[PDB]
Design a protein around this ligand. Structure first.
Ligand SMILES: CC(C)n1c(=O)n(CC2CC2)c(=O)c2cc(NC(=O)N3CCO[C@@H](C(=O)Nc4ccc(C#N)c(Cl)c4)C3)ccc21
Length: 218
C-alpha cells in the first residue's frame, strides 16, 4: 500500500461518490433561497402520518439505491463475497444516508431540502416524533458546522460502510484489509488538504448507530 496507490484510492473513492451523490452540492446551495411558504408547510402538516411515512420511505429507498451504487464502485467491495456485501449494506446504508443529509441542510435557518424546497423540522409534524426528528436535525447541524467537503463525505462514508466489526462476516480479514486502506486514504487526504482538525470533531460511531436504530423503530 504505497503513496501513489493510496492516492489512487483517494481519487477513486471521490470519483465514486461524485458519480453517485444523488444531487449536486451546487444545486443544493443555490436552492437555499427556495423555502417552503407558511401555506405549504401547513399543507405538509395536514397530511396523514401514513402519507408522510410513504413519501419518506420513498425518498429513503431512493437514497439507499444511490448508496448501493456508491458501494458497488468502491475498490474491493465487489471482490467481497455475496454474504458480506449484504451484511455491510444492511448495517451501514442508512448511516451513510444520514451523513449525506448534511449537504442538504442549511444551518443559517435550520432547514433541509425536501421535495423541491427547503423547510424546517415542523414540516414532518404529522409523523408524531419530534424528538427523533430534532436530533436528526441536530446531527446534521454538527456536520454542517465542520463544513464537510464532498471528498470528506466520500471518504468518511466509505469507512462507515467498510467496517470489519459488523456481525456475520464470513471473511473478516478481507474486510479489515479494505478498511485499513480506506483509513490510510482518509488520513492521507486530510493531511494533504490541511483538514486534520476534523477527526476529533466527528461524531462517535455509536451516536450515528443509535440514531439510525431509533429511525428504524418508526
Ligand atoms: C425524515 C427527514 C427529517 N429526513 C431524515 O430523517 N434523514 C435521515 C434518515 C435516513 C436516516 C435524511 O437523511 C433526510 C434527508 C432529506 N433530504 C436530503 O438529504 N436530500 C438530499 C438528496 O435526497 C433528497 C431526500 O429527500 N433525501 C431523503 C433521505 C432520507 C429520508 C428519510 N427518512 C428522507 Cl425523508 C429524504 C434531498 C430530507 C429529510 C430527511
Amino acid at each position: 500500500a504505497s503513496l501513489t496507490e493510496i492516492e489512487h484510492l483517494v481519487q477513486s473513492v471521490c470519483k465514486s461518490y461524485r458519480e453517485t451523490c444523488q444531487l449536486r452540492l451546487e444545486d443544493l446551495l443555490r436552492q437555499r433561497s427556495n423555502i417552503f411558504s407558511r401555506e405549504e408547510v401547513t399543507g405538509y402538516q395536514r397530511k396523514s402520518m401514513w402519507e408522510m411515512w410513504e413519501r419518506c420511505a420513498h425518498h429513503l429507498t431512493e437514497a439507499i439505491q444511490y448508496v448501493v451504487e456508491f458501494a458497488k464502485r468502491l475498490s474491493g467491495f465487489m471482490e467481497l463475497c455475496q454474504n458480506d456485501q449484504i451484511v455491510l449494506l444492511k448495517a451501514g446504508a442508512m448511516e451513510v444516508v444520514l451523513v449525506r443529509m448534511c449537504r442538504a441542510y442549511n444551518a443559517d435557518n435550520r432547514t433541509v431540502f425536501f421535495e423541491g424546497k427547503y423547510g424546517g423540522m415542523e414540516l414532518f409534524r404529522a409523523l408524531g416524533c419530534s424528538e427523533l426528528i430534532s436530533s436528526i436535525f441536530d446531527f446534521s447541524h454538527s456536520l454542517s458546522a465542520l463544513h464537510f467537503s464532498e471528498d470528506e463525505i466520500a471518504l468518511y462514508t466509505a469507512l462507515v460502510l467498510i467496517n470489519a466489526h459488523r456481525p456475520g462476516l464470513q471473511e473478516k480479514r478481507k474486510v479489515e484489509q479494505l478498511q485499513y486502506n480506506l483509513e490510510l486514504a482518509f488520513h492521507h487526504h486530510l493531511c494533504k488538504t490541511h483538514r486534520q482538525s476534523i477527526l476529533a470533531k466527528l461524531p462517535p460511531k455509536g451516536k450515528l448507530r443509535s440514531l439510525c436504530s431509533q429511525h428504524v423503530e418508526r
